[PDB]
Design a protein around this ligand. Structure first.
Ligand SMILES: N[C@@H](Cc1c[nH]c[nH+]1)C(=O)O
Ligand SMILES: [Cl-]
Ligand code: NA
Length: 236
């Protein structure tokens, strides 16, 4: 039996987070556990870290796989292996306070400040748009607590962020700060596991397991539980 170390986070509610009993859980975590169950030649264990360190760790060989709703991009494919079978969609839109109707196009960001998560695909998508627009807006990276994305939108310190409907909808359920998506879909990447380029055997095994999880209806059930019925599909 080969031990596989999976890098993930703890700061994505319903995706990778610690519950009331200090147990790591959420969609990505539970999917990996389901995959492990179906691969008797492997044992999967987790290594939790800041999201921003996950691909630094993967690149240094300190984890074998990353599971954190990772969007496929050509930049990431130049460095890492993606498995073939997707396990979510992560369509990105500008996201604003529910009261704010001043922004639809990215052109409406001129002179404004956008807050995002360092190292995320959405940050890259925004960077490229900024450059296309002649550097006409500011991109900043969230911090913790009162400096997180939601709080900087609440106070007006940030005018917008970039996010996906399933995530926005879940956050809104319990928050005083209501966010909404606006405008066009800026990126429509699917979500996969990320591995080292040498890890072709493991990637194939993961795809076999994930396909069986799709085929028996388990992914439908897992996605309904964690993502909500509106975001739950038989396959992605
Ligand atoms: N989907 C993001 C990961 C993420 C961070 N926070 C929420 N999602 C990416 O591919 O970079
Ligand atoms: Cl196996
Ligand atoms: Na296993």
């Amino acid at each position: 039996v080969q031990t596989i170390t999976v890098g993930t986070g703890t700061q994505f509610p319903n995706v990778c987070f610690l519950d009331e009993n200090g147990k790591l859980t959420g969609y990505d975590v539970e999917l990996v556990k389901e995959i492990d169950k179906r691969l008797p030649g492997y044992k999967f264990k987790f290594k939790t870290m800041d999201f921003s360190n996950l691909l630094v760790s993967l690149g240094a060989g300190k984890v074998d796989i990353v599971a954190h709703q990772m969007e496929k991009s050509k930049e990431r494919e130049k460095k890492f292996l993606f498995n073939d079978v997707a396990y979510n969609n992560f369509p990105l839109q500008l996201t604003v306070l529910d009261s704010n109707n001043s922004i639809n196009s990215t052109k409406d960001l001129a002179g404004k400040r956008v807050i995002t998560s360092a190292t995320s695909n959405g940050a890259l998508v925004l960077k490229k748009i900024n450059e296309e627009q002649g550097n006409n807006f500011e991109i900043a990276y969230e911090g913790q607590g009162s400096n997180d994305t939601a709080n900087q939108l609440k106070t007006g310190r940030a005018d917008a962020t970039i996010s996906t409907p399933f995530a926005v909808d879940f956050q809104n359920k319990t928050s005083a700060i209501k966010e909404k998506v606006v405008g066009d879909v800026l990126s429509n990447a699917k979500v996969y596991f990320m591995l080292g380029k040498d890890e072709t055997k493991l990637s194939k095994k993961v795809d076999e397991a994930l396909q069986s999880i799709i085929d028996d209806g388990t992914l439908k059930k897992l996605s309904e539980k964690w993502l909500g019925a509106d975001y739950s599909k038989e396959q992605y």
